Design a protein around this ligand. Structure first.
Ligand SMILES: O=C(O)c1cc2c(Cl)cccc2[nH]1
Length: 167
């Protein structure tokens, strides 16, 4: 049993809810929250900007030190950093950004990072301002992630469409 409430079950291991991932993290304090990161860990907008704002910029301060030491992530890659006030850990995962012309086949590689964690709270990757089709992102998630993932989708309108189109 876990703390996640109000989710629709899509598969054995994937659950979905219309929720603000920031407000969901604040309530649950999950072991892992996933950030929709870029390779520079520059948390300006989208899910990353919202998570970082909720940490009072501490996420960005920590991220800048990580990049100064290690250099940029790979598209499809990830790193584990603090979850600050939101979670124990934040898994920063880089999905391909269609608005930068990145290979959408890298979305499966991105979701494979989730398999290193038994339970996660996560946004659909590459969706929103990353320009991928969220329906596609949910299909790759279900077909890739084998650990237990709780998806918090921001838009009530994109949410209802994801449920009603899910195969
Ligand atoms: O609600 C979602 O699933 C979602 C929103 C979003 C943004 Cl704005 C940027 C990157 C990934 C994202 N996922």
């Amino acid at each position: 049993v876990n703390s996640f409430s109000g989710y629709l079950k899509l598969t054995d291991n994937v659950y979905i809810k219309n929720a603000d991932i920031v407000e969901e993290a604040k309530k649950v304090k999950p072991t892992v929250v996933v950030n929709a990161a870029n390779v520079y860990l520059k948390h300006g907008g989208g899910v990353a900007g919202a998570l970082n704002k909720a940490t009072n910029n501490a996420m960005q301060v920590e991220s800048d030190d990580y990049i100064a030491t290690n250099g940029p992530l790979k598209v499809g890659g990830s790193c584990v950093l603090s979850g600050h006030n939101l979670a124990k850990h934040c898994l920063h995962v880089v999905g391909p950004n269609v608005n930068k012309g990145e290979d959408i086949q890298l979305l499966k590689s991105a979701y494979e990072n989730f398999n290193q964690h038994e339970v996660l709270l996560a946004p659909l990757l590459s969706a929103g301002i990353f320009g991928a089709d969220p329906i596609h992102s949910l299909r790759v998630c279900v077909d890739t992630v084998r650990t237990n993932v709780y998806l918090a989708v921001f838009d009530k309108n994109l949410y209802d469409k994801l449920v009603s189109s899910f195969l």
